[PDB]
Enzyme design. Sequence first.
Site: not given
Length: 315
Positions: A36, A93
């Site tokens: 991330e 993500d």
Amino acid sequence: LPRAWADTAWESYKSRFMMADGRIVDTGNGSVSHTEGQGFAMLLAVAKNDRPAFDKLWQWTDKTLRNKDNGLFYWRYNPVAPDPIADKNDATDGDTLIAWALLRAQQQWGDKSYGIASDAITASLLKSTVITFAGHQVMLPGAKGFNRNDHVNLNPSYFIFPAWQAFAARTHLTAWRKLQSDGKALLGKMAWGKAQLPSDWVALRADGRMEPAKEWPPRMSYDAIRIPLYLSWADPQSALLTPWKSWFQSYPRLQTPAWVNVNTNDVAPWFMTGGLLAVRDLTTGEAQDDPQLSAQDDYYSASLKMLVWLAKNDR
């Protein structure tokens, strides 16, 4: 008193969190890095037209965290551990942000290898992390260990719509379009408690029954707060913003709880500031000054500041 007119938010950001080896380091929590963080830094680096920083960030990410089995990325790196990657599993993500960054890289600098790399990550995402559960297409938080039996554990903050939008546009694949549509459908049904808000972690059952996942506190907190960031980023007039505008509206700007329990309607004992507040102002449309990063900002808050800035910038 701080007179640093000659510093910029992005350079301060590099100075605080970027190691020369390409690592983004969360100096708040044990100098760890993660996909991330890398993904976030790479988007900022493209928007800031900073190719050496992008190339460093990517090179480190790809050399260090690439899971060759599936083409995704081992999600966390702990430099002060015998095995610096004990958790041999990805976060979608993170994967997404990286691939999304590479894509935007191609658009910014035209170098087609970027798009190629991007393409291979998004095909890996489709292969290993997207499935059919209930009557819908979903992206699991990771290729391993989130699909249980009668349910799957999802994190709606991993639903990165503006990336998906870009994936769909570049690749033309319907898979990315339906993934948006189903995700927008599901998210819309993900409201609980007096807030009617998403929790960080949601369990989806085969019958389509959804629930704040048992294993984490049923809170709209440090993950869920990203949803409106992503929503507004992809369509500032998105109807999914509504629960969020309603909830922010329900509190004074400077006294908004940092999180809310969606099962018991209890709230955090401290208020949003910095980054979180940048997210609120984004959701409500309250004019924001360009991010100024102070020492009072930790890693997450400085990041939210910059991402909110970039979501605004894509218009």
